[PDB]
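Internal QA ticket QA-208
Title: Verify multi-chain structure generation after dependency bump
Assignee: T.L.

Test input:
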Amino acid sequence: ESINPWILTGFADAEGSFLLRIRNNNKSSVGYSTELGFQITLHNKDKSILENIQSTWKVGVIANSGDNAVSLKVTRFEDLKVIIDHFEKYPLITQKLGDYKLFKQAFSVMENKEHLKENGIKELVRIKAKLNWGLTDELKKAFPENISKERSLINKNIPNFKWLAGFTSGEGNFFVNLIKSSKLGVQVQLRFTITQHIKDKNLMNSLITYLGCGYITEKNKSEFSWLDFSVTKFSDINDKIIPVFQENTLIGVKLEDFEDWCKVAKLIEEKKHLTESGLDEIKKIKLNMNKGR
DNA sequence: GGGTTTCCACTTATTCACCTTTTTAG
DNA sequence: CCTAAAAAGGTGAATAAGTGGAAACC
Ligand SMILES: [Ca+2]
Ligand SMILES: [Ca+2]
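Actual output:
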């Protein structure tokens, strides 16, 4: 099929990226050439998602990104109009909305060909200073007279379950937890999570009310921090999580892990997880999920 | 035809996904 | 006692984000 547009924006909120290149250049009149676009890089196993997007928007080029990943890149200027038309109708809701807004300001600058005149590049740099990781060291030297306005924090709520399915297609984990505990000796526990940096803590907190279950767990690694929304109560997983993605279909290989997750759920609901044979079946499903596929 | 646009190969750091065991709740 | 639910603990890598070089093109 071709990707539902709210799924697509949810996936883009999770995996997308806007780019603005401002390249030192001797062959350009202004001394710099530019390139603007939107891009997605995934593991090779989900090349299909990217092809589905390419054919859904009917723009963008696909290339390998190393030997284990592949990317969809859209920088052909005329084709950016399809990106904008899509994100005006179906807007992002994470902080990435801020990066989209800058992409859009840079689009105007180039639509008027202002990116050739010296003043035109000065505005692209001003814009670029607050996009993603901002200006390179080399760029701050070329333009130390730059002062750019502070960037508003985005705070937007989940628009609907389609957005959620696309976002969960990016950030979610459907997990079968096997706990030592032993007379049978293995408690089967389903876990659902969604992972996201603290910068979108508001959206992450809203998930408890949006889905009617779960809890936020704060996580750390070196100096970095982020958040998990987690559900571990079987009834909530069986009555609240599973129907949402049944009605609102995941994409990529992660749909297969969801489908296996649902097989284990059916077995827990039938108490087969408390029998030896059912336990064995669950181990086999777990074996071939996620990293084991 | 040559200044600019587009494309394609390729790289890098950390926010994701995914994993295990222990402890507490019921 | 027994089973479920949550907490405690951990990290490899698929992401986000970016770069070099050059052919395609107006
Ligand atoms: Ca993300
Ligand atoms: Ca993902």
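Spot checks passed. Residues A 15, 170 surround calcium ion (ligand 2) (CB under 6 Å).
Status: verified.
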